[PDB]
Amino acid sequence: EAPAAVVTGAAKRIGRAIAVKLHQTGYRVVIHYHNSAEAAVSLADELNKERSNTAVVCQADLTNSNVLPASCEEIINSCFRAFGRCDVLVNNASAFYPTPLVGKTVETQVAELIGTNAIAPFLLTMSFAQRQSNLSIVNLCDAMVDQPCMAFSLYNMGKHALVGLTQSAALELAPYGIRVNGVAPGVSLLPVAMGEEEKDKWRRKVPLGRREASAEQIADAVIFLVSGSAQYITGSIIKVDGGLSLVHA
Amino acid sequence: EAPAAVVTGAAKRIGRAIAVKLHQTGYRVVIHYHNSAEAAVSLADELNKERSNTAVVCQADLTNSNVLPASCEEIINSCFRAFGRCDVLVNNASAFYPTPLVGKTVETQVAELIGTNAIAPFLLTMSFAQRQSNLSIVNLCDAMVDQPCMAFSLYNMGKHALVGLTQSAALELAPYGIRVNGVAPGVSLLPVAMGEEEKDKWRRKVPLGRREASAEQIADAVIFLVSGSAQYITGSIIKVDGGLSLVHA
Amino acid sequence: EAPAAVVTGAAKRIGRAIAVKLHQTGYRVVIHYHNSAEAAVSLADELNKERSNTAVVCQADLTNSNVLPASCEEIINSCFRAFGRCDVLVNNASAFYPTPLVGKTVETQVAELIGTNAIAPFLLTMSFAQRQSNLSIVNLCDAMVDQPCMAFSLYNMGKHALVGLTQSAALELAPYGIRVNGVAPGVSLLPVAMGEEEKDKWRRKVPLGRREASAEQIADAVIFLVSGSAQYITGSIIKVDGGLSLVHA
Amino acid sequence: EAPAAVVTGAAKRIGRAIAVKLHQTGYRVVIHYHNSAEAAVSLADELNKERSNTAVVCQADLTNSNVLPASCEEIINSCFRAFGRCDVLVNNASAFYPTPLVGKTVETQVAELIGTNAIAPFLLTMSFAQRQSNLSIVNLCDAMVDQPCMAFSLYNMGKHALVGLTQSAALELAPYGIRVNGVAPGVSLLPVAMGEEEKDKWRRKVPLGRREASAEQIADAVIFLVSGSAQYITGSIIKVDGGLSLVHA
Numbered sequence A, B, C, D: 001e002a003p004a005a006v007v008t009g010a011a012k013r014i015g016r017a018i019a020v021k022l023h024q025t026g027y028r029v030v031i032h033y034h035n036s037a038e039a040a041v042s043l044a045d046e047l048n049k050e051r052s053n054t055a056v057v058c059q060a061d062l063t064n065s066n067v068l069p070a071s072c073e074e075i076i077n078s079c080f081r082a083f084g085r086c087d088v089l090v091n092n093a094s095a096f097y098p099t100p101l102v103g104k105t106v107e108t109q110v111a112e113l114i115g116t117n118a119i120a121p122f123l124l125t126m127s128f129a130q131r132q133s134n135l136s137i138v139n140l141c142d143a144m145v146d147q148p149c150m151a152f153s154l155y156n157m158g159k160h161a162l163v164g165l166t167q168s169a170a171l172e173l174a175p176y177g178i179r180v181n182g183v184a185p186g187v188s189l190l191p192v193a194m195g196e197e198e199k200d201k202w203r204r205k206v207p208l209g210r211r212e213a214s215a216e217q218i219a220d221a222v223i224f225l226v227s228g229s230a231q232y233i234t235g236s237i238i239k240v241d242g243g244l245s246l247v248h249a
Ligand SMILES: NC(=O)c1ccc[n+]([C@@H]2O[C@H](COP(=O)([O-])OP(=O)(O)OC[C@H]3O[C@@H](n4cnc5c(N)ncnc54)[C@H](OP(=O)(O)O)[C@@H]3O)[C@@H](O)[C@H]2O)c1
Pocket: A008, A009, A010, A011, A012, A013, A014, A015, A032, A033, A034, A035, A036, A037, A060, A061, A062, A063, A091, A092, A093, A094, A095, A096, A112, A116, A140, A141, A142, A143, A184, A185, A186, A187, A188, A189, A190, A191
């Protein structure tokens, strides 16, 4: 039987590339999304056209709240409902915007940034583990966590907490044979809100080819970590950043 | 005129020792507490007997919620009300208990552990900075973040997020002359919940002296970081762990 | 034309598995060895029997000395003389023994431990780069560098320097399209000098399976890093330790 | 009886400031130097004028060689000869120049850069310990070791090795009461070679005050680490970099 994977924030960009590559490797996929309903349905159609009954969509807000554990349980439930199993969880969904220390209320900013980047991954990990071959979780981290964007405290706190989760969950789930790893992009697909001048600035900074990573290049690292070639790898975060994090100010 | 400090969770143990040492150095202190009212008021009394009106108490739950931002603002406000200035913030208050992946609901565990260890520090940092010499913030971290206690994922996530805040805030608040640093104990005052047998096991692990750090030894590192001897130090986290984090399994 | 790889200390154990796996991927290989002449020649025979003219041996002492630069030039030259190209360098050879701070002279201990683990990798990297498609270097690091073996100062210094070389060379060689990465085992094939009781002690410490990594599992990570699936990865060190480094004392 | 300290490369700049601050705290000092003979004697004169028989000089080349252990043993021996004791060792002496991967020979470059920055500190640490109250060693590291200067591979390897030594020595010497710590400047006193425009470029990168650390600010952190206020601190490296290491490319 074909293994099954949940990918959060999978309708567009990097999550989409991850879902595609997992599907091409022979996984059945749950394409989680929040607002991008059209993109999610389009992707599921494309994958199902390739192999019948191998993709479903699942809408959920991953903002922190008292109902978040239920939403995360439901996401894992949807994989079992559709495919009778859940072998891989990819924590990809992420809010990313400035929250200066000196629009949305601060409580909404905390809920969105810490919810999406850390708490939801934690609750999904809980639900994945409790519902339990080659089982693993892959968390999308950030190569630049120690050299963060100016005025992105909450996002950075989220991504640091995700490192903590990766390590804590790797340790605790090891006896269950569940591996937990991370992939840490530097610059890949640049944020849509970023200006073209700033995009070019970031590109110029990357030692390896003066260009951002393709979404597929990020996906390749995810593929490795879920594969039989990573059977002894747990609690590892693989930087995929073309040397960006090595460059001084 | 004497500088003023806010110390969270200052009624007992490490927070108490920090408040005492800051006060002995010449600081006016806000003693924040949650449940330990008797201890907080008693500490304030002891310090005020030493120097008139140099200590006030401020109660607040630092659990994450929609009122946390108001609560943190009021803690900083209490410093300005009492002393007309706030020069130092020490983020010391912390929930610490296991949250296995496989009586409190999980959403409450999230709120308490991420709130006290990360979100409250962020909001206090916001309020501290907004309301503005030698200004600085000291965050009580954990030397063992990368070798975490089994089944303490939320605690570890919170402490990882605090490292991120320490670094993000150091970067962002440097132009304002506010330094942001951390002190990371290994084993200091062992939890009251811990049995004496387990306490002794941990003591035996410490390379430097086969004993835990006194609260006063942790306080010494805080005192250094707030002092004029650390005026170029920001974004640094000083382990005070007697070599504990250096010891392999 | 098939790509060519140099593997240092390739006659036995992990180096041997790496050479075998690279050969199975379609590389021609230079088997470097120091003392294990019979094993090196036996390996070359085996690989050449598999595919004619795809394996050669090169003997060299990688101890630090005024002749080492020439020895490292010789090893790289060997690949060019046999195969007309050199696409991959794997720095695997390593001296590993205690050097207590409080029989080999200390200067010999420095020469051997810093030589094999750091200086030779540096000199080999230099010769590799100067002589220059998917070019990369993989350095065999240590997942336990920050929780080192008691009384192994020089070994640990060597492996720390190797991390530095990995990052420094990744930065400097990126514009040449040469990637530089690391693979960091925790416990793999236990040292032959280790007693059986201690071997089982280490095995029991590994969260993921309570066993050491096979040399093949280490080799799998090397294969990934040299592959087209890692084209954007440079300056990254992949732990392959089954969560060992995550375990507190 | 006043305690005694050895400071390597103490004739000028940061080493001078450390020797001066130690002397002002009440230490008798050995001022080691290599080429700066006049500056070393002039410093010892100033300190002896302040307090009689409290400063001596000691010439030694710290380049790696087969005689380096003897030189390092002699440096420690000179502290015992002059003062009858040796309480503190500060490893400050350092070669710093580019060694591009693509008229000093490479073997000289290895010997100077790895010798001064790593091997000499190891041998001095060995001799210090063997010859043995508040005993400690302070190693001068580099806050930018993970974001290294382009084409400075050997310097960077040396400073990484010094981190390894700091940790390994802290672990091993903790049972003897000898603490081993590090101070990691970002930009302090800029190389005398540098022009004013290039100096200002580096100054402008520092978040905290747009300026380099004074030698005194670095020395302050060394003073803290040797003091009674750091009695539980071992294996810690304190960045003194004004946030420099936190700034992305
Ligand atoms: N792109 C880079 O250069 C880069 C660099 C470093 C790290 N990363 C990490 O790599 C991962 C993927 O990067 P990316 O740029 O592709 O991510 P992205 O486009 O910024 O976000 C991916 C998805 O996150 C989902 N999301 C946002 N808020 C949500 C919420 N409240 N609830 C549920 N889902 C929510 C959105 O889904 P919908 O569109 O359906 O609403 C969004 O499409 C992220 O974890 C990111 O932090 C990326």
